[PDB]
Amino acid sequence: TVPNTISWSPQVALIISASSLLILLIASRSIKYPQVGAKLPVLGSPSVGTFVASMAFGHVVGAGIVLGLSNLGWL
Amino acid sequence: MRGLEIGMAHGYFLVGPEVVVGPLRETAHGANLSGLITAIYIAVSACLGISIFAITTFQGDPRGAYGSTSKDSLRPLRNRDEWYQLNGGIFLGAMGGAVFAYLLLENFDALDSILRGGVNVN
Amino acid sequence: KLNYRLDTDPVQPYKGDPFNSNFSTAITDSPLARAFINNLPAYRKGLTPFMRGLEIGMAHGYFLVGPEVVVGPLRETAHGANLSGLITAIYIAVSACLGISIFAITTFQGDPRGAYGSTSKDSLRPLRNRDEWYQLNGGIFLGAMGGAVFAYLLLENFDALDSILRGGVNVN
Amino acid sequence: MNISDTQVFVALVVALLPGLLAFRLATELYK
Amino acid sequence: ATKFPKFSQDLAQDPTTRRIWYAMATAHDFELHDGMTEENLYQKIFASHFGHLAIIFLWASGVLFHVAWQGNFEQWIKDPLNVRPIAHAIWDAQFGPPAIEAFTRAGATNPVDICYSGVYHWWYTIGMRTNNELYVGAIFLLLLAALFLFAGWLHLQPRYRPTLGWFKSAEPRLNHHLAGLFGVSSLAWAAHLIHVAIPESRGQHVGWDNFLFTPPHPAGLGAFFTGNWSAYAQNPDTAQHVFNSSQGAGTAILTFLGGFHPQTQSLWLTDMAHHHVAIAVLFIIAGHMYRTNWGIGHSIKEMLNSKSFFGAKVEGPFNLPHQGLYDTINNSLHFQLSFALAALGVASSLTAQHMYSMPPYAFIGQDFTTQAALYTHHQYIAGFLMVGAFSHAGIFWIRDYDPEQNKGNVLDRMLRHKEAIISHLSWVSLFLGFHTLGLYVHNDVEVAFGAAEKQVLIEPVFAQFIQAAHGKALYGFNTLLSNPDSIASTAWPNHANVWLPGWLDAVNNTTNSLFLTIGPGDFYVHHAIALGLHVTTLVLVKGALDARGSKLMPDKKDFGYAFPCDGPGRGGTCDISAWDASYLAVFWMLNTLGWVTFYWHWKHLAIWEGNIAQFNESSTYLMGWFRDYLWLHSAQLINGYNPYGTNSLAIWSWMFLWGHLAWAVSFMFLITWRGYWQELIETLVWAHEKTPLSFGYWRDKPVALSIVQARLVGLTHFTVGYIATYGAFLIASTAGKFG
Amino acid sequence: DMTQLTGSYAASWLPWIMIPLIFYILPFPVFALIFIWIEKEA
Amino acid sequence: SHTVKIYDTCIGCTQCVRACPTDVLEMVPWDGCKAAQIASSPRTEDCVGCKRCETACPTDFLSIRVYLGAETTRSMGLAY
Numbered sequence A: 001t002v003p004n005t006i007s008w009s010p011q012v013a014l015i016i017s018a019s020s021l022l023i024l025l026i027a028s029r030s031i032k033y034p035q036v037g038a039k040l041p042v043l044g045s046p047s048v049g050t051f052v053a054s055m056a057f058g059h060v061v062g063a064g065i066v067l068g069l070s071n072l073g074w075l
Numbered sequence B: 001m002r003g004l005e006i007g008m009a010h011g012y013f014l015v016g017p018e019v020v021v022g023p024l025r026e027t028a029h030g031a032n033l034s035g036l037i038t039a040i041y042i043a044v045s046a047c048l049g050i051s052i053f054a055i056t057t058f059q060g061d062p063r064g065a066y067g068s069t070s071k072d073s074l075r076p077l078r079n080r081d082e083w084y085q086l087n088g089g090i091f092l093g094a095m096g097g098a099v100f101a102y103l104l105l106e107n108f109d110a111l112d113s114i115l116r117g118g119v120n121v122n
Numbered sequence C: 001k002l003n004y005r006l007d008t009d010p011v012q013p014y015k016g017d018p019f020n021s022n023f024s025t026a027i028t029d030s031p032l033a034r035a036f037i038n039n040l041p042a043y044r045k046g047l048t049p050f051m052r053g054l055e056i057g058m059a060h061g062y063f064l065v066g067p068e069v070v071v072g073p074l075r076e077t078a079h080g081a082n083l084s085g086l087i088t089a090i091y092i093a094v095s096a097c098l099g100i101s102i103f104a105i106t107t108f109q110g111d112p113r114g115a116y117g118s119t120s121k122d123s124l125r126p127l128r129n130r131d132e133w134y135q136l137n138g139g140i141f142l143g144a145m146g147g148a149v150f151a152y153l154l155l156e157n158f159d160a161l162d163s164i165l166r167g168g169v170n171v172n
Numbered sequence D: 001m002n003i004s005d006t007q008v009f010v011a012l013v014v015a016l017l018p019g020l021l022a023f024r025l026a027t028e029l030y031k
Numbered sequence E: 001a002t003k004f005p006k007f008s009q010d011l012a013q014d015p016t017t018r019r020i021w022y023a024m025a026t027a028h029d030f031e032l033h034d035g036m037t038e039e040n041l042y043q044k045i046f047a048s049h050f051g052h053l054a055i056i057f058l059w060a061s062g063v064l065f066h067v068a069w070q071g072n073f074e075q076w077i078k079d080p081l082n083v084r085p086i087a088h089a090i091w092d093a094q095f096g097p098p099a100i101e102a103f104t105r106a107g108a109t110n111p112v113d114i115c116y117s118g119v120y121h122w123w124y125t126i127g128m129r130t131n132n133e134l135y136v137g138a139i140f141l142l143l144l145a146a147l148f149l150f151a152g153w154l155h156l157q158p159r160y161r162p163t164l165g166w167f168k169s170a171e172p173r174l175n176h177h178l179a180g181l182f183g184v185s186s187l188a189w190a191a192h193l194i195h196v197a198i199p200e201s202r203g204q205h206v207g208w209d210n211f212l213f214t215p216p217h218p219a220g221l222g223a224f225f226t227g228n229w230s231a232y233a234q235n236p237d238t239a240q241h242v243f244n245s246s247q248g249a250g251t252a253i254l255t256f257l258g259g260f261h262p263q264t265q266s267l268w269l270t271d272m273a274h275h276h277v278a279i280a281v282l283f284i285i286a287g288h289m290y291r292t293n294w295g296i297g298h299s300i301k302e303m304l305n306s307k308s309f310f311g312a313k314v315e316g317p318f319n320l321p322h323q324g325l326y327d328t329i330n331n332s333l334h335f336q337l338s339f340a341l342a343a344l345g346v347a348s349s350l351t352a353q354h355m356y357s358m359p360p361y362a363f364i365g366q367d368f369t370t371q372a373a374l375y376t377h378h379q380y381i382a383g384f385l386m387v388g389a390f391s392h393a394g395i396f397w398i399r400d401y402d403p404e405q406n407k408g409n410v411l412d413r414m415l416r417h418k419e420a421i422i423s424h425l426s427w428v429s430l431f432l433g434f435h436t437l438g439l440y441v442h443n444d445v446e447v448a449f450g451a452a453e454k455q456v457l458i459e460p461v462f463a464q465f466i467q468a469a470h471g472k473a474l475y476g477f478n479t480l481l482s483n484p485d486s487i488a489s490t491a492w493p494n495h496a497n498v499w500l501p502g503w504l505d506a507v508n509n510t511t512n513s514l515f516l517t518i519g520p521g522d523f524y525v526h527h528a529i530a531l532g533l534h535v536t537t538l539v540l541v542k543g544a545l546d547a548r549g550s551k552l553m554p555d556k557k558d559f560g561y562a563f564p565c566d567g568p569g570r571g572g573t574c575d576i577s578a579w580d581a582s583y584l585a586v587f588w589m590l591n592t593l594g595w596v597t598f599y600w601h602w603k604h605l606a607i608w609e610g611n612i613a614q615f616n617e618s619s620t621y622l623m624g625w626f627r628d629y630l631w632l633h634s635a636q637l638i639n640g641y642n643p644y645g646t647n648s649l650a651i652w653s654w655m656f657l658w659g660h661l662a663w664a665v666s667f668m669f670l671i672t673w674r675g676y677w678q679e680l681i682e683t684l685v686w687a688h689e690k691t692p693l694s695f696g697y698w699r700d701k702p703v704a705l706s707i708v709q710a711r712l713v714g715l716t717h718f719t720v721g722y723i724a725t726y727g728a729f730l731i732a733s734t735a736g737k738f739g
Numbered sequence F: 001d002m003t004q005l006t007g008s009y010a011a012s013w014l015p016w017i018m019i020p021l022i023f024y025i026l027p028f029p030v031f032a033l034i035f036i037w038i039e040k041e042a
Numbered sequence G: 001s002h003t004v005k006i007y008d009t010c011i012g013c014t015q016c017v018r019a020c021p022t023d024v025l026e027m028v029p030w031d032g033c034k035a036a037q038i039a040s041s042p043r044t045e046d047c048v049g050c051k052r053c054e055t056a057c058p059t060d061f062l063s064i065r066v067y068l069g070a071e072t073t074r075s076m077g078l079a080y
């Protein structure tokens, strides 16, 4: 059978927004070289490269989470 | 040579008990095999004991009766090489004597005909 | 600026000599490897050469019987297979003992060439005398013949021994 | 239906790893 | 001198055989090793604990593998009440055909042992169904043991050896072992019960292949986060539920029904799941009590050293000086070991007392031999653990206690009134022994003279009242839970006694062991048990408190924990060390546990026979115990083999004798002492030296066993014979008359 | 038949070989190893 | 070898020396007691540990104490 995929709803937006936000908090304070390049609070003042990296990885991780949950009936 | 003679005698006589009163005594073939195996096992265990005795005894100046200054006339093998040669002779003689007894018992019908002159019919 | 970092090297030079064509590895220098290899009958300290050969012959003659019994050309019958395995062990062991004899004849002339010379320091080849080789060879032959016969007797009596190890001899 | 020959052999092979690790631990503790 | 032992030059220079013996007896006494520091001590202990955990995991893996390989688990699943579980196969090449036939049973085509450890029922309850699952569990446990062995090796490497401060940090260890080791483990076990065990008990297979997309409850996890927890308690298993099937099966994952499942006669799986959930929550809460790295949390040193109760000047908690104790426990490994052993002994006693009355495993209450074996096993282990707790208490008194850092605290006060403590323990022991033995032999004489009505038969009215208060209406009492109108039973403010119906149904069921009916014989045997407990405690406490010295030996602390004596002077000082007190107390522990297990076994044998009257009328005099329990039930055991053949009890018959042999041997080590054997050995030494052809010669001079070694060896033989004999009798008398 | 030790489990020859090995073949060499270990001069 | 220690409560009664079966002890000049002598243990290598000296000692508590230690051939009292 084809794994189940759900229509768009506020929960998938919550997962993607949260995954991007958690990655933003971790990456700006854990990666080897943040604050490299042009500059953009509670964050470590990440650079434009670090922020775009965290948003791109937030989409990557977020898509994996929502597809994984929807596959298993919310795990 | 000491080990060879001692092993010959002991391996020869060690076969009999399991042959006569062992658990395979109901059939001649099994009884002889069990006696031979018992003799082999006992002799191999004794030879392993002799080997480890030689290993542990002869370090530096041996303790007790095998030391340099000991005058024990009943224990004259004061060298490790003598003990290892003795052990080799013991093992070979014990195996030979056990096999000799096994062959004599396995051919007991033929040997009994031999000692009664029944082989002279033809 | 040059850091060989030898002091933290997991693999050290063998016995502290970096120019002896050897390394201190787990196979060559670990405590278990040294204990096992140095206590084999070839290297066990204090053993007479005859006793070394006796234990080596016993072990080798015992297992040399096996291959021809199972996959040999007489394997179709139990009695024939056992005999062929015994003869194969005898032929191999006698050939090896002949090789050991002519090795001793040719190696020990004057000062032996190579690793058996007076000035050689080969720790893996400690039988430096002609007498030790002939005592070793006598032990090798007698041990190999005895071990081969011991395997031959167990295989020849396998039906009885199988009943022995299952308790079938306790019926009567 | 109990386990098969292959499973018994695989268990025997697997048990070698804890055996070697136990030997290593015992020798380390002996130091 | 010899290399062995590596940890003692004094032993390594010993030229006698004693060097070997003591080398085995002091190998694990790390603190006495040559050049031992505290940090090295703790690191070696850490590695040894890793090794012991690996050994435990290997043992569990072996049990699982042998059941999966040679057992009959799948056959036993289809009929747990009539199929004998198989422990493992028998390979004894010196068996005869009668023995092979006798031991070929339980549906097997080869000789097998019958499992009595209860692992079949346990694995059945937790949802295991196939031999492949047991095999996978065994492989996983092999891998886990390998992991722990590697961890033990790793934490001995120079970079990973923990510092002494890491071992001494008590508060983080307590936090992690309460919240994580106890709490998180309990939560994970409840998760296993909810996700796997309960669906399997309801005929639904849940494994690694489908547990990710098979919710345990229809309401899902949404009901938990929205506060709709009651949805988890809706639609429980019906009273007509059939285990391992969907017939009569509900959907609830966390009920609180109480009582027993009507068919399996064991605790409800959902009840145990909710139990472990609540226990996990409580332990996770308890794991946040102490401060580690964030300021919040209690400091144990501050609590023990505190002297102000909200301003008022108090000498300590309950106005008792507890100051200086934090360093006492934190620096004494023997004090911690004493608490750990005492806690484990109490836990084992509670395990034994609570599993027979409230069976947690399906149908295990109907496997009588398994029940008896488990109870006896855990009670004897508890007794040994208690003995060890007090032995290491004495070791603490000698080695780790100094009066200066404990000046004036509660431990010093106990040491100061040790005389009153010991004298009052002796008085309690004397009173109990005198009156219990006197009443028993009075009943003996009255029954022997044909006057059984003249026995003193004191009713256990207090325990009967407790049983009635727990809901047992048999006695006619109308108090608390046996009174439906009582405020305890109604719980007037809230009426939340959702446990009471099932609990009362289980209590008043006559076919289980929940609050068994008790009469005068139970009274007398409980007082015998109290006598045994008090005497064993007296021996252990007198040894621990006198370990530092007494009037006979004021300077005992300078001689160590275990020494033979102080010579024949001052009247004689045999068995004067605290080690000797532990040695003597092992005898009393064995005797007390023998009484306890005799009582349990005879009562349950009478119940299972259908002859409760036999126990009720015969347990009030000691001849009843001697005749109707031992002699009467030894017949099938001693007829396991006879001149007319052998049956499956033959092994027990042999072991029953074997124990009697070992016990007898112990007497030789306990009655005869050393000098006799030393002189005999000297004579044998002369004989060997003067005999020709005897080329052997000792490298270690043969000597008689030391005094302490002799006591230890005699005690070991005594205990081994005790255990083997009673175990053989128990198994033969229960299995020989039942499944 | 019940006149011999047998095994219906997988690889029933394994007890057949392993019981002798553990109980009366290897134990004497193990005792020899231990005896050599405990008698070694320092 | 065993360890034999003499404490300052010794009264120089010489009984421990007389009771010793292997001559471990002797009497040496001293000033701490009226007898002007005290027990000494120069030959603890020969001490078998019989504790006859402690039995002979009249003080309370003992002025001479034997602590059993590493066992040698002569400490076990072995004639072989």
Ligand code: F6C
Binding pocket: B042, B045, B046, B048, B049, B050, E684, E687, E688, E691, E693, E694, E695, E696, E697, F028, F029, F031, F032
């Ligand atoms: C080593 C070596 C040696 C030798 C040689 O060399 C010897 C010899 C003697 C003579 C002289 C006499 C006679 C003999 C008989 O009969 O008895 C015995 C028996 C047997 C069997 C013994 C045994 C023998 C040998 C040991 C053999 C060995 C072999 C094996 C097999 C090995 C094995 C190995 C493996 C590894 C296990 C004796 C005796 C006595 N023993 Mg005496 N030994 C010794 C050892 C030992 C030890 C360890 C111990 C502990 C246990 C003892 C003990 C004893 C006692 C109690 C007594 C008595 O009483 C007796 C008498 O004195 O009279 C009088 N002793 N020797």
Ligand code: F6C
Binding pocket: B012, B013, B015, B016, B017, B018, B019, B020, B021, B100, B101, B104, B105, B108, B111
């Ligand atoms: C228990 C216990 C017991 C038992 C059981 O019961 C027994 C048995 C038995 C039986 C199997 C027989 C028989 C069998 C009939 O009858 O038939 C056949 C015969 C024939 C074949 C015979 C024929 C003839 C021949 C060959 C001759 C001989 C030769 C020689 C050895 C040489 C000599 C040289 C010089 C002079 C010495 C016998 C004989 C014996 N022996 Mg008896 N054992 C016992 C003991 C002992 C002791 C201690 C001692 C000491 C040491 C002993 C010695 C001896 C001797 C020498 C002898 C021989 O001549 C043999 C024979 O092996 O053989 C082959 N046991 N082994």
Ligand code: CLA
Binding pocket: E024, E025, E026, E027, E028, E029, E030, E337, E341, E384, E385, E386, E387, E388, E389, E391, E392, E395, E561, E562, E579, E582, E712, E716, E720
């Ligand atoms: C987790 C539990 C635990 C731990 C860690 C310890 C740890 C320790 N105990 Mg202890 N003890 C315990 C439980 C424990 N015990 C219990 C339950 C009891 C009551 C029986 C005792 C009674 C006890 C005494 C009386 C003494 C100790 C001593 C010691 C210390 C030295 C050990 C020793 O002598 O070398 C290792 C010792 C042995 C290996 C003994 C040999 C085995 C005995 C004889 C049992 C017989 C074996 C039996 C036939 C089969 C068992 C299974 C087999 C595999 C061995 C050590 C710190 C000693 C000490 O501190 O000296 C001052 C000491 O005198 N303990």
Ligand code: CLA
Binding pocket: E426, E429, E430, E431, E432, E433, E434, E437, E535, E538, E539, E584, E585, E587, E588
């Ligand atoms: C059947 C065996 C047996 C019996 C009856 C006792 C009895 C006793 N032991 Mg004991 N013990 C035994 C075996 C036994 N032991 C063994 C094998 C060991 C291992 C070495 C020990 C180790 C041991 C220790 C270490 C301790 C005891 C203690 C005690 C006493 C505590 C119980 C008590 O006061 O009850 C009341 C007394 C009794 C029941 C004894 C019998 C009284 C008789 C029947 C009175 C009869 C009077 C009558 C006129 C006599 C006739 C005349 C006659 C003199 C000719 C008690 C005297 C403890 C103790 O002394 O505490 C006070 C203690 O510390 N025992």
Ligand code: CLA
Binding pocket: D011, D012, D013, D015, E055, E058, E059, E060, E061, E062, E063, E065, E066, E088, E089, E090, E091, E142, F014, F015, F016, F018, F019, F022
């Ligand atoms: C502690 C666990 C344990 C125990 C007590 C047993 C007990 C037994 N096994 Mg066994 N076994 C186990 C685990 C265990 N098994 C595991 C994990 C495997 C898979 C590798 C096997 C595979 C196996 C086979 C193939 C056979 C037995 C057999 C037997 C019986 C005879 C002994 C023998 O030949 O051993 C043989 C043992 C092995 C082949 C390997 C054992 C591996 C374990 C893990 C070693 C455990 C070491 C231990 C924990 C350390 C002890 C420390 C010491 C202080 C006590 C006996 C009932 C024989 C049998 O059934 O006879 C009827 C038999 O032929 N076992």
Ligand SMILES: CC1=C(/C=C/C(C)=C/C=C/C(C)=C/C=C/C=C(C)/C=C/C=C(C)/C=C/C2=C(C)CCCC2(C)C)C(C)(C)CCC1
Binding pocket: B008, B009, B010, B012, B013, B092, B093, B095, B096, B097, B099, B100, B103
């Ligand atoms: C003292 C005395 C006595 C005794 C004696 C005895 C004890 C004897 C014994 C004897 C014996 C007991 C003997 C034996 C012998 C033996 C022999 C003679 C052997 C031989 C062998 C052989 C010849 C072998 C060979 C072989 C080998 C080597 C290898 C290959 C195979 C074969 C088999 C060929 C009497 C009483 C009478 C009298 C008085 C005195």
Ligand SMILES: CC1=C(/C=C/C(C)=C/C=C/C(C)=C/C=C/C=C(C)/C=C/C=C(C)/C=C/C2=C(C)CCCC2(C)C)C(C)(C)CCC1
Binding pocket: B040, B044, B091, B092, B095, B096, B098, B099, C058, C059, C060, C062, C063, C142, C143, C145, C146, C147, C149, C150, C153
């Ligand atoms: C390294 C190692 C190993 C291996 C091992 C091996 C390789 C083994 C082999 C073994 C063998 C391979 C053995 C054998 C042995 C032998 C024997 C034991 C023999 C004996 C013999 C005899 C006894 C003989 C006798 C005789 C004679 C001399 C003469 C007359 C006749 C007769 C026969 C009697 C393993 C993997 C496991 C593990 C890891 C490590």
Ligand SMILES: CC1=C(C/C=C(\C)CCC[C@H](C)CCC[C@H](C)CCCC(C)C)C(=O)c2ccccc2C1=O
Binding pocket: E668, E669, E670, E672, E673, E674, E675, E677, E678, E703, E704, E705, E706, E707, E710
């Ligand atoms: C019999 C006896 C002896 C003599 C016993 C001796 C010297 C020991 C003999 C043991 C022999 C040599 C081996 C026995 C081995 C055991 C069967 C198993 C040991 C297992 C461990 C080695 C693992 C004493 O020396 C003694 C001393 C003090 C009080 C009582 C006694 C006492 O009763």
Ligand SMILES: [Ca+2]
Binding pocket: B119, B120, B121, B122
């Ligand atoms: Ca003719």
Ligand SMILES: [Ca+2]
Binding pocket: B023, B024, B025, B026, C169, C170, C171, C172
């Ligand atoms: Ca027979």
